[PDB]
Write a protein that binds this ligand. Sequence first.
Ligand code: N1N
Length: 193
Amino acid sequence: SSIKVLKGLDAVRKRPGMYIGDTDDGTGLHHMVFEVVDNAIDEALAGHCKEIIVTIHADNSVSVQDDGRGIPTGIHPEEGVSAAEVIMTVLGVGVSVVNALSQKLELVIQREGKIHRQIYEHGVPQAPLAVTGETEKTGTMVRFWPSLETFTNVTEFEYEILAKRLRELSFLNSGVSIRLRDKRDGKEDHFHY
Ligand SMILES: Cc1[nH]c(C(=O)Nc2nc3c(OCc4ccccc4)cc(C(=O)O)cc3s2)c(Cl)c1Cl
């Protein structure tokens, strides 16, 4: 299972434009955010998520936080690791593509009364998903640092590109609240049809 996962991550890194879009003109870079957001939108479509928060951090990482069910955390029997880790690492291109093309990715899940956290580097988990505390909230937070071994030329997120797509998704999923926050300059928008 471990050997197949590393090979799948490698397949994405070998042909990244094919999975995420052009890696030099900023298309693929912004599609990384859109893939994560799309998973949060799917959680809204299923009737669980009401609010999505997208943050451009000061270090040009992006986080997406939802208030959905939380990715399942229990051990998946075939692989012997958390279901969350399987979803994050086994190949709508799937969040595993974003993980494969991220120098670092942080996952925080609130589910069944617990907070769970895991860190990845180039898709490789640094430790098993672990409990960090108790919570009465539910949801998923993914923060990723795009790999500059993949993304060239356009490496800094464009607020306006994200804002336009999130406004579209708020209109097309009326009822969902989407917040966009830029920690680089303090800009914020709230989209809620
Ligand atoms: C920001 C974000 N949110 C999510 C997310 O909420 N995904 C979820 N998938 C799931 C989920 O999906 C499991 C799954 C679906 C398709 C393929 C493999 C596993 C199941 C259950 C459940 O049964 O309670 C809950 C959730 S929440 C993802 Cl993935 C990302 Cl990235």
